[PDB]
Amino acid sequence: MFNNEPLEQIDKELHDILADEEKRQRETINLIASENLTNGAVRECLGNRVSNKYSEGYPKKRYYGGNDFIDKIEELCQKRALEAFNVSDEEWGVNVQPLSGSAANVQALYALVGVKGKIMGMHLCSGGHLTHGFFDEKKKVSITSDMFESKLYKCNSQGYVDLDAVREMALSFKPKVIICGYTSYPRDIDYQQFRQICDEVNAYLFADISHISSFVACNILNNPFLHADVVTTTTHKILRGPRSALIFFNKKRNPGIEQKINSAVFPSFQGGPHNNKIAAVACQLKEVHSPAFKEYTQQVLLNSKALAKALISKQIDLVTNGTDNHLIVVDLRKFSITGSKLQETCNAINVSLNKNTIPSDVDCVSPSGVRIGTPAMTTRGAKEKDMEFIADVLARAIKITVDLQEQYGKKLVDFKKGLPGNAQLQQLKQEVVTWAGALPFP
Amino acid sequence: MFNNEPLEQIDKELHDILADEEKRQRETINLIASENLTNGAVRECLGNRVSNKYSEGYPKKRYYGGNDFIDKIEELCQKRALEAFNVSDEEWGVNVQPLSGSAANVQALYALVGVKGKIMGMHLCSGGHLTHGFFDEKKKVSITSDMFESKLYKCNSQGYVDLDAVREMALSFKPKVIICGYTSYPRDIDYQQFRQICDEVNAYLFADISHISSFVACNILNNPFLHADVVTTTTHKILRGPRSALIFFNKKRNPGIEQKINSAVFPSFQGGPHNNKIAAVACQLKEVHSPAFKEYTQQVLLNSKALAKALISKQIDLVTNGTDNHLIVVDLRKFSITGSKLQETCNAINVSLNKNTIPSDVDCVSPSGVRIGTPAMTTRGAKEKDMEFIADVLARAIKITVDLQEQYGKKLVDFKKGLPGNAQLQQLKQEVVTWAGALPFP
Ligand SMILES: Cc1[nH]nc2c1[C@](c1cc(-c3cccc(CCC(=O)O)c3)cc(C(F)(F)F)c1)(C(C)C)C(C#N)=C(N)O2
Numbered sequence: 001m002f003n004n005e006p007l008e009q010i011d012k013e014l015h016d017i018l019a020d021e022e023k024r025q026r027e028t029i030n031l032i033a034s035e036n037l038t039n040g041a042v043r044e045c046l047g048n049r050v051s052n053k054y055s056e057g058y059p060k061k062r063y064y065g066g067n068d069f070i071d072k073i074e075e076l077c078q079k080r081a082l083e084a085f086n087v088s089d090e091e092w093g094v095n096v097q098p099l100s101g102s103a104a105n106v107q108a109l110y111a112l113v114g115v116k117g118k119i120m121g122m123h124l125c126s127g128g129h130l131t132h133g134f135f136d137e138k139k140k141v142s143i144t145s146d147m148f149e150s151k152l153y154k155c156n157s158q159g160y161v162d163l164d165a166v167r168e169m170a171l172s173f174k175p176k177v178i179i180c181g182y183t184s185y186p187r188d189i190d191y192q193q194f195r196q197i198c199d200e201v202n203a204y205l206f207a208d209i210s211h212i213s214s215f216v217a218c219n220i221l222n223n224p225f226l227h228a229d230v231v232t233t234t235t236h237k238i239l240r241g242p243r244s245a246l247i248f249f250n251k252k253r254n255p256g257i258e259q260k261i262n263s264a265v266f267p268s269f270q271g272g273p274h275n276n277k278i279a280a281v282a283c284q285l286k287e288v289h290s291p292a293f294k295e296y297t298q299q300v301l302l303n304s305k306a307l308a309k310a311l312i313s314k315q316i317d318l319v320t321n322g323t324d325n326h327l328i329v330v331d332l333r334k335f336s337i338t339g340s341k342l343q344e345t346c347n348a349i350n351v352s353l354n355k356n357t358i359p360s361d362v363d364c365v366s367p368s369g370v371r372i373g374t375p376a377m378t379t380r381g382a383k384e385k386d387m388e389f390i391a392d393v394l395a396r397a398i399k400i401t402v403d404l405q406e407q408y409g410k411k412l413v414d415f416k417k418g419l420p421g422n423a424q425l426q427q428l429k430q431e432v433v434t435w436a437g438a439l440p441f442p
Numbered sequence: 443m444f445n446n447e448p449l450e451q452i453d454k455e456l457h458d459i460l461a462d463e464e465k466r467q468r469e470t471i472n473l474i475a476s477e478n479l480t481n482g483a484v485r486e487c488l489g490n491r492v493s494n495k496y497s498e499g500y501p502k503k504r505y506y507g508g509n510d511f512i513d514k515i516e517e518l519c520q521k522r523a524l525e526a527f528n529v530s531d532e533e534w535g536v537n538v539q540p541l542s543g544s545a546a547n548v549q550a551l552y553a554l555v556g557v558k559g560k561i562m563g564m565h566l567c568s569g570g571h572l573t574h575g576f577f578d579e580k581k582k583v584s585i586t587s588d589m590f591e592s593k594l595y596k597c598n599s600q601g602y603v604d605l606d607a608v609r610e611m612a613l614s615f616k617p618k619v620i621i622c623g624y625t626s627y628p629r630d631i632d633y634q635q636f637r638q639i640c641d642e643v644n645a646y647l648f649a650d651i652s653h654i655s656s657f658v659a660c661n662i663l664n665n666p667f668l669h670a671d672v673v674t675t676t677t678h679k680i681l682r683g684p685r686s687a688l689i690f691f692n693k694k695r696n697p698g699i700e701q702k703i704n705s706a707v708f709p710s711f712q713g714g715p716h717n718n719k720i721a722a723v724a725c726q727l728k729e730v731h732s733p734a735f736k737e738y739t740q741q742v743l744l745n746s747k748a749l750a751k752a753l754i755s756k757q758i759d760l761v762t763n764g765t766d767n768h769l770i771v772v773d774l775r776k777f778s779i780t781g782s783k784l785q786e787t788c789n790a791i792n793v794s795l796n797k798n799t800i801p802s803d804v805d806c807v808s809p810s811g812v813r814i815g816t817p818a819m820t821t822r823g824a825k826e827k828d829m830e831f832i833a834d835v836l837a838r839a840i841k842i843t844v845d846l847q848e849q850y851g852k853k854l855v856d857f858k859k860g861l862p863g864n865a866q867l868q869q870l871k872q873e874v875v876t877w878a879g880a881l882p883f884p
Pocket residue numbers: 123124125126127128129130141183184354355356357364365366367498505709713
């Protein structure tokens with residue numbers, strides 16, 4: 001007693017908006033540093049009937065039976081996760097149930113410190129995540145600043161993690177956990193120095209590697225698994241999996257961590273796992289462990305170096321004057337335009353990017369930059385040669401943004417009225433559309 | 443630069459376990475009160491490319507642009523949610539972003555009361571959810587007992603919510619929130635009396651209607667929207683959507699609740715929404731608001747009445763001696779077998795059900811019952827006359843369980859060696875497999 005007509009037949013209204021969404025994805029230069037594009041197989045998993053099954057608990061310790069095939073999938077996902085990140089299952093455990101990055105982080109933090117526990121993370125404005133303790137004078141914006149007592153450490157005036165400040169803060173503050181690994185940080189991390197500071201105060205080392213996961217797995221960047229107690233990562237960004245997350249824990253350094261983490265995830269925070277997700281993560285994690293995916297990750301860094309270099313060749317400034325990874329932050333101060341203006345200008349030409357703070361911005365009220373990244377376009381087949389066009393397209397957008405601001409004024413409402421029906425934007429948009437539409441699309 | 447080979451080719455190992463899972467679902471009498479079967483259209487949405495898009499924030503106020511089509515989908519979902527539950531968008535709002543039921547409950551509770559806040563809910567062992575404040579002497583098992591101060595109210599010795607106890611507890615405890623609507627409660631809820639008790643102490647009324655959502659939407663059971671401040675519900679149980687959740691908030695009774703709930707969901711707890719989920723939820727809510735779906739829901743209650751009646755005709759005892767909804771709790775005390783023994787026996791014959799506490803069990807250590815429900819089998823096409831066969835099968839499972847306990851003893855490890863190779867079970871399984879396999883399967 002159900003309706004099995006296809007999606008197009010059952011709901012024509014939704015099917016159009018979805019077909020529209022797909023066209024816009026195909027015809028966009030996607031430089032969102034956190035986005036990627038899943039293959040058809042990962043998307044077969046996400047729509048599988050395995051999401052019908054309730055399986056609260058852990059493998060061989062479920063609350064319900066009938067979880068034999070689910071238990072194999074969940075055990076296969078865990079095994080593949082450990083192989084991908086070059087860790088022995090004797091020394092490391094992994095929880096694969098967290099529904100997303102933020103949930104994983106709050107669960108892992110709670111496991112380690114509990115309510116009223118003390119944590120340290122990078123400030124939002126300096127490239128830290130919301131779940132690293134973010135707050136403001138006006139409110140405790142993240143639950144990680146409310147259910148915990150958090151203190152926030154800044155990057156220096158050149159945009160680098162200031163280690164002497166991390167130490168200074170830790171010795172006064174004496175937190176149980178210090179979070180490293182960031183959302184918009186363009187350089188690699190000195191995990192060893194973090195491990196040295198943690199020991200000095202007896203705090204846990206938390207490495208959130210969501211943005212750089214593929215680089216850690218494929219050994220292109222430093223390995224926090226050598227120094228870290230806990231490693232969290234999303235599976236949807238550079239790793240190219242479904243929207244999910246992983247919590248890694250170091251048994252050898254912390255006997256008894258396995259139970260606290262597992263109990264934090266269920267039944268402290270979550271209920272039933274989303275088995276379609278776990279299936280999909282298994283499917284991608286097999287791809288992560290091939291040499292073909294290493295080729296892909298290498299290309300992400302090759303594109304990102306090329307892109308930063310080409311942007312500097314057009315006299316555009318970058319925070320830290322370069323990148324060690326997939327992402328660049330563009331400092332827009334020399335043009336006297338804001339990040340939100342360029343984001344509007346770039347949406348108007350089918351270029352996907354986000355506004356982003358820079359070290360000079362005291363506040364988060366007006367970010368002076370945009371953040372961009374190569375994983376999405378590297379997935380779509382762009383090589384080092386293609387990055388000169390993207391830098392070209394971004395340079396033109398900055399110039400048009402400066403023209404429009406001159407004509408209509410620096411207020412955002414006044415700025416925007418200039419956008420629709422702009423001859424150059426329509427021309428640039430058609431240019432963006434013609435190249436992007438051609439590219440391989442999974 | 444991606445591998446577009448189909449799931450079967452790209453990963454044969456996972457694909458076989460998934461084809462196995464599908465076969466087991468097709469050949470199981472699924473009586474899990476919380477499970478259902480999504481149609482193909484809902485599963486087309488869950489695997490849609492819309493899950494590629496990051497879209498933190500809310501519609502028309504996203505952090506990123508490029509969210510035009512996502513915003514229509516998310517606006518279409520909230521609209522369809524308010525229409526489904528017979529509420530005016532002037533008086534009621536809905537957040538569609540929570541990833542699952544437990545997340546929705548923790549976020550909504552945080553919005554209302556904050557950290558250290560006071561909440562009241564039904565005890566786990568009496569049919570309340572984990573996220574209703576569940577703790578034990580030993581541990582604060584749920585975050586809702588830890589990030590909040592919770593007190594737990596029990597049902598009476600006949601399995602009914604004891605209102606006199608709820609009121610007595612509220613006047614001593616003085617919580618900010620009182621939770622009603624449960625996981626294993628076989629009767630309807632007197633929300634009006636709950637709303638009368640909340641006013642008297644000045645606490646908010648929280649209705650978690652995850653198990654009975656289709657009954658509220660279709661006007662078969664009492665309507666908590668007449669009385670409640672907040673209504674949460676999952677979309678994957680009787681409602682038959684994807685794995686997701688909804689927080690409803692009553693704007694008229696509480697000005698400014700809209701922002702508090704929206705900010706609790708993001709940026710307090712979550713980050714990026716899962717747009718494939720929201721698409722899928724949108725798609726199913728169209729089906730929910732149809733006369734065809736109401737026919738289905740009515741059939742769920744008809745099958746459940748019939749099933750309770752047939753079980754009583756075979757001298758099997760039901761908690762509260764019946765049901766007003768989709769679910770029945772069988773009390774197994776007269777046979778001297780435990781719920782977990784029958785769960786193993788029932789898994790051994792492809793009958794999916796769960797072990798469940800009853801009123802007599804002071805401790806959760808040994809649940810003396812099983813919980814069962816009709817939504818899944820009603821979806822597969824069973825009618826009232828089919829319920830005698832399910833009651834026959836369950837009676838036979840209880841008897842075989844008594845036989846096996848006789849032979850091998852009442853200790854659990856001993857009990858299970860009797861199960862594999864048991865001639866009657868192989869015979870009963872074969873009976874189960876032959877009937878279930880034939881039924882319509884979405
Ligand atoms: C949306 C989001 N999630 N996590 C992030 C951000 C992000 C961000 C968050 C926010 C953000 C999000 C939610 C809440 C707040 C608090 C300030 C407010 O209430 O407006 C800021 C703002 C920005 C902006 F300043 F550029 F507008 C940027 C980026 C990646 C979009 C950010 C930065 N900068 C960092 N570090 O991390």
